[PDB]
Design a protein around this ligand. Structure first.
Ligand SMILES: NC(=O)C1=CN([C@@H]2O[C@H](COP(=O)(O)OP(=O)(O)OC[C@H]3O[C@@H](n4cnc5c(N)ncnc54)[C@H](OP(=O)(O)O)[C@@H]3O)[C@@H](O)[C@H]2O)C=CC1
Ligand SMILES: COc1ccc(OC)c(CN(C)c2cnc3nc(N)nc(N)c3c2)c1
Length: 186
């Protein structure tokens, strides 16, 4: 089991969602990026595991469920078994990393990506150890009902560049966004 990473797209108001949907109109290349990063494994015969809260799971269009080519795990304390389409269910983030360490998954998983929600990100981010945050800054304000937790710059360092991550401002549907990579080790 390799790397623990968080991936999120956030608006200037730090918004991540609205009535279980993204706060901005769909961005085709931001989405290809999201798919590219979470799907690519840096080891042969290995696949990445994607961890998400129950609401995040339900917010993905059903035809896109489960996320293909990745092991999908849902986080819930109320669910008795994994939702239709999902592979695993854990009652906590710690319980989910533990399972990574079971001979079950131990030989099959490379990277572990946290893809949502606020609740899940906030605990990953407080988790001790090595962690990277792949943040897409959507350079405008969007009405939102769910937000990304504040990033502690005394703990997270913005990287100057990262292989396979564009460093300049992109634009889609008249919306400007840029990709950022933050790293921590505590
Ligand atoms: N812009 C982006 O990058 C992303 C945007 N989104 C959007 O954000 C919203 C989804 O948001 P969010 O509300 O934060 O909800 P979650 O996706 O994180 O779901 C909340 C539920 O998930 C389970 N859960 C969540 N965290 C934990 C934990 N740490 N341990 C155990 N169970 C946990 C619980 O289920 P229980 O009650 O069942 O125990 C909890 O009620 C939608 O708006 C979605 O579209 C989502 C992901 C990324
Ligand atoms: C799998 O295709 C989709 C299609 C529509 C979706 O929102 C409805 C989703 C939801 N959803 C999981 C999603 C979409 N874009 C994202 N971008 C970044 N940078 N980080 C994320 N964590 C993220 C997550 C996934």
């Amino acid at each position: 089991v390799g790397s623990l990473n968080c991936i999120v797209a956030v608006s200037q108001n730090m918004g991540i969602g609205k009535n279980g949907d993204l706060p901005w109109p769909p961005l085709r290349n931001e989405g290809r990026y999201f798919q590219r990063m979470t799907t690519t494994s840096s080891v042969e015969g290995k696949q990445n595991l994607v961890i998400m809260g129950k609401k995040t799971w339900f917010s993905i269009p059903e035809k896109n469920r489960p996320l293909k080519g990745r092991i999908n795990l849902v986080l819930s304390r109320e669910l008795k078994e994994p939702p239709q389409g999902a592979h695993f269910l854990s009652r906590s983030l710690d319980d989910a990393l533990k399972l990574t360490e079971q001979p079950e998954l131990a030989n099959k998983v490379d990277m572990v990506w946290i893809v949502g929600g606020s609740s899940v990100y906030k605990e990953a981010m407080n988790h001790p150890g090595h962690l990277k945050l792949f943040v897409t800054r959507i350079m405008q304000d969007f009405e939102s009902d769910t937000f990304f937790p504040e990033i502690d710059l005394e703990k997270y360092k913005l990287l100057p560049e990262y292989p396979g991550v564009l460093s300049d401002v992109q634009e889609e549907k008249g919306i400007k966004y840029k990709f950022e990579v933050y790293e921590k080790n505590d």
